[PDB]
Amino acid sequence: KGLCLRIRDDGPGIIIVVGNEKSCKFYENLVMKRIKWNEDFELHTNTGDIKM
RNA sequence: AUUUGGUCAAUUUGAAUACAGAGAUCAGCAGUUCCCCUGCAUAAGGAUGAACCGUU
Fold this sequence. Notes:
The protein contains one helix and four strands.
């Protein structure tokens, strides 16, 4: 249970996560260790693929 | 100088029959315990993956 809100798409936003403790821990791990947020990526659109 | 270490049992008896006394050998498999591997389940506990936006 929870959510992920954010401002203006590109802007800063909040994840809230709620549940059983193990699950929460797992989620945290995913957020921090597994995902690389600073990593570069590609946006796919009809006009052209935008490198970010 | 002599002699004991020498009684077959069993059965039929009121000595005769018996005659030494009645399964062997070879081979499987399973179980018992411990160990190792393998697949599955059960709990727990990780690790990780997967496009893209979601819900009043």
